[PDB]
Here is the input.
Amino acid sequence: SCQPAPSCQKCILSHPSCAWCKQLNFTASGEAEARRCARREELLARGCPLEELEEPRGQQEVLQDQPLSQGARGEGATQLAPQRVRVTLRPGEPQQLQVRFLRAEGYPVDLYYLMDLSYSMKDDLERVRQLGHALLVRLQEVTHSVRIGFGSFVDKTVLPFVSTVPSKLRHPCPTRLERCQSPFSFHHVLSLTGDAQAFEREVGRQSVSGNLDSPEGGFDAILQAALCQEQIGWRNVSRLLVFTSDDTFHTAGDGKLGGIFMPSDGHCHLDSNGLYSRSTEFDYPSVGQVAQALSAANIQPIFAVTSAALPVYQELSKLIPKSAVGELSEDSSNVVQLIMDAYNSLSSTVTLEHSSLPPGVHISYESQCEGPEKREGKAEDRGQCNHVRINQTVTFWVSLQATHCLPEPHLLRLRALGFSEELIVELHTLCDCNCSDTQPQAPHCSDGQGHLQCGVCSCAPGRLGRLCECSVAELSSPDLESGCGPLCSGKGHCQCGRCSCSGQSSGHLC
Amino acid sequence: FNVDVARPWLTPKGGAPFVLSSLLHQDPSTNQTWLLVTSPRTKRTPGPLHRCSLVQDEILCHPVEHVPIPKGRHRGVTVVRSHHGVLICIQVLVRRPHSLSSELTGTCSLLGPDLRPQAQANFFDLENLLDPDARVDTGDEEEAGTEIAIILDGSGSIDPPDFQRAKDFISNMMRNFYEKCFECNFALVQYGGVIQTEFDLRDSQDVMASLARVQNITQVGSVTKTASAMQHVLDSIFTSSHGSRRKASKVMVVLTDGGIFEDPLNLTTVINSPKMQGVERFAIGVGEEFKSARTARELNLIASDPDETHAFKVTNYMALDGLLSKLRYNIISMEGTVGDALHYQLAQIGFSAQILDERQVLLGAVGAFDWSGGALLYDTRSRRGRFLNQTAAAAADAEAAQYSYLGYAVAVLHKTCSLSYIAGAPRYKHHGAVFELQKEGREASFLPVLEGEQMGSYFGSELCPVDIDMDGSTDFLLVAAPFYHVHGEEGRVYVYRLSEQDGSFSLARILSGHPGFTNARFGFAMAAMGDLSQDKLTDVAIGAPLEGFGADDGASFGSVYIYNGHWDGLSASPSQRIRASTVAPGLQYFGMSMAGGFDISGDGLADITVGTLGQAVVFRSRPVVRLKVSMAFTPSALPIGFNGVVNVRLCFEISSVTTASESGLREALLNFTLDVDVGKQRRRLQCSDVRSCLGCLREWSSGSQLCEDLLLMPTEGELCEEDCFSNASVKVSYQLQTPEGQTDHPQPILDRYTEPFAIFQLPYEKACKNKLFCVAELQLATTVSQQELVVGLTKELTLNINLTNSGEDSYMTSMALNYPRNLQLKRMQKPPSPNIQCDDPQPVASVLIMNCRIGHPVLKRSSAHVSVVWQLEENAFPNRTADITVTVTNSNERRSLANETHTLQFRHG
Ligand SMILES: *[C@@H]1O[C@H](CO)[C@@H](O[C@@H]2O[C@H](CO)[C@@H](O[C@@H]3O[C@H](CO)[C@@H](O)[C@H](O)[C@@H]3O)[C@H](O)[C@H]2NC(C)=O)[C@H](O)[C@H]1NC(C)=O
Ligand SMILES: [Ca+2]
Ligand SMILES: [Ca+2]
Ligand SMILES: [Mg+2]
Here is the structure.
């Protein structure tokens, strides 16, 4: 476990169980000043008392901890407590953090409706242009402040994705007797608002469109909704992105077929009209890029797709945390119940994740979220709990483990997925020792010049010894080990120049 | 490593040859190396391909003539080269004049190895050149449109009820025309007597609004001025002021009932106009006055009637729907059917390419058959090819293979005496897959052999077959999934080992980029760089164009990873990682393309090029040297208490066979570091001068040998209390220090896979019969007090071991006592005569190893005697085998081993 070390700092860095002793030159009995690094008992029984040994133990201090409050009416809900803690951990020692999450009722929600408009959604659009009032009323049952917006996408307006024939660009529809609009990549139609009349009017002004190949450019629309916060109108509440389609999607490598070599740059490109007009200059975003942008924006995607497209979006939602997949009808007639089910299944689940661990630091979770005594197993990368009820508070036990040292106070940012609430951990490593026994040029230790620089007295260069009294007598003589047993019988371990025992027996006689 | 990042060559950033891809091409007749780059067409540079050379320490690019010229928008350029020539393909859009569809395939040109034209090939109307019986070897925008103008009479002779019938007929005719015609609009004016302009063909885009506008007309009625109506139609309806197309087919529809009267203009004057050099005119003259009077001749003059096709005389408005079909027959356009199956129109043949030999190329077709994919095997001289694809056996798996993008990447696997074409399908089942053409009989189809595991990772978009030892048979296949997701788009390369017996694939390794980059796109570009490291083994470069993206102040981003090929495969880790920040400022997507294996700097060593999005970077390769060191100790044996000068004759020699390093160690400096007595806590030897064994920057310049003369001295009197009977090991640690600046010729680099140290030992003459080693026998005669017993009758089990040394000399000998942990020692007894040290360790749970520190060089021919009294540590064990083994280990040059065993048997279960 613990082995003899030169100084207190190296001794504590060697093993968490080491119990370096700092008594004032009590080794003046034939013992080298490098064997004061062992367990607690071997240093408490051997000379120094409780005052003259310093075993450093890291601790955690809570900086700000406001109580879990459910706002006033979904207004100021605090759900994650504490919010800023300072954790100082000695290398090799566990540190347990108690993180509580409360599922406040009436938490506000923003729902951006991102629709497909590829002429197979004509009846879907006909239903959606009236479903706004129903959606708002139904969502007002679980929350009090709900805001809904609308967007749409078709595809990039180049071959082979859409037919760029000039007559087929103005009217991408099979017949000219029906009304429809020219293809686009992403049109932000309505910003998140609280009235359903604006939703009805704006969506009813929209028309269907069309393209050439089956996969759609919905990833571009998803990325632009995640990135353009000021234009969409996101706030700091739970954000839902309802993605409705009846076909697959284009990914990052698909734009090469249209002569598009430039990768998607991850910048907001909506013009004053809400159009993503420079979409033919960038390629489609990738699954990883879209997932990263959605995670960074705390948006939970809801994929409302038909039965023929379900498995692809099941895979995609397996690749994206905090996402839901429902089965959309052929005319989007079940979209409100789908949205409600997805929102309930997303709110019932609480996940706690860490931003990034510094090198040598390990994290583990213990999801105690039913009963104040029952907690599940450790060694996970997520504090996951499902079926969390309203007004119920869950608990997570976060364990931190540092191996060597941390030079800088790197900040850890534990957070609950789908929420802007954050838990900042100031991660300092207690791998420097301050026993206060050190005195600069102390007369008690060494002789003349030189400082201890540690609990053990550093020998002056002028002469060798505990106080430079004997250059070689203390250092060289090995009779001090030979004194080590009689009557120990093996129940007691040997001691330098003695025999140590336990269990009502003590001393060399034992 | 080899790549000289400190001296790169860059194309100008002004984007004159805006670089999309870059490769090195050599003519294997004159050994001329070029830097062919591909660019998107602009107003400044129309050419798709340029050839660039290293002239006066600058890259000068010139367009390559006789290549297809892109028109309009950039749609895609691919360039591949082999020793057979250079193949360039551009995606070309062709619009069918009488159809609402478009063809998007490639126009390719095959150049010879000297960049001279060999063959041209366009794959529009592919079915003409598709002969499927040719066995596969396998080593065995102006708009024409149509504009129609309607002239509806509204004179006072027409009662209001008839106006409704005429309006309904006009609306029905427009509706049927829109049903049968698409790229064709409508406009009309009210021929009532006051020349008023109704909705024009600009408003005809919204068909429903035009119908309501037509339904909203009202008849006023002044007088029948036909010529004025025609002139107004010419001046407003057919003029391009409101968007009328100049070449649009212009059709005039005139339905009149009253003849010309009170018209200042003449009917014959308006028809004989220069602008009427071909315009369609129709005259549906409902009315009995036409039949009964001269104004029938007026009707004939209104519209030309060579075959009476335009003349439509009807008696009443009730038959308007009767002759509507006849009116539609000769005016409607019968545009080409839209919705036909997509077989080869958007096949995009030449999306990826591969030169198989002088006459044959392998061209990928991503979009064939609803983007199912495929590959065209095209013979350039016979101008005949065959199409290869998955060949689904039904209609369910034909639709299941759609949008798989087969032929996105195409490659060739070389084997013992056969070839094997492979193709990537980066969205097959949404993971990606690699297909291989497996022939049987005369039908060859691509079947999947490898698949991805992550959705959207684009497995199979990049294919890199690697032949490590250059024997003509590929050993490895590198498959990239550049958008593989862990936290962002990291990228992943899969290394597959090709079996030499049948050609199967085994996942040898999974490669990744440097940790800490969530966006890297590792594997987006990979290439076999030939031999960069000068070991005759192929090495691989993998680019990560997105490493460092989003940096402040527009810093350069992107990385390239160099993997040296070994006899067992690729390296575990990259030898080099070339970041764009250390190459040049303002490099975006460094690592988008790469190519190597040919000497472009003139030094004789093959070097590489890395293409960024907009620029091409050229790096020269450094010579690789390996040194061989040798000591020449003069005494050759340190005598007892030498206290004399030890002479050292270090002599570095260039063991590398990379010819003569051209201006190599001519400028670089060697750096010695002599570590005398490495390993010992108290060194018994040290250099006479302490400044010649810490760091010594000597200049080599000319010559392949560098020799030195050092001196070794004893330390502070050199007391022999330490282990004098052990060889003193001295470690030479050389290093290479290159100068600072732009050297004209590349500076050498020490081989990374040769350890740069040369541990040597000089032996102390051990006092013995042979004064170079003291070997002694360690004989033991341990006696067992009692062999075994059980049930407390054991009491204190006793053992006795006596070690006897009677050979020459025993040096740092070792003990080993192996007894099971079921028994434990209450007390331990040391050997009294003499006081031989014995560092007995603690008991261990496993097989006991009491490596007691007996012996030491001081040990004479005396003997030891150790007493041991065992007792069971609250453990009972049954009868076993091998009993207890005791081993004596001597750390001399020659090892003498002693073995002893006891007897154990108790008869109590
Ligand atoms: C692989 O390529 C072959 C051609 O080299 C494809 O076969 C072709 O498939 C198309 C349908 O996509 C066939 O067209 C249809 O033919 C039927 C009669 O069989 C006709 O009734 C339809 O109206 C339509 O014209 C075409 O005939 C057929 N040609 C051949 C030579 O087989 C095959 O589909 C491709 N496989 C995959 C998985 O993409
Ligand atoms: Ca539908
Ligand atoms: Ca599409
Ligand atoms: Mg669609």
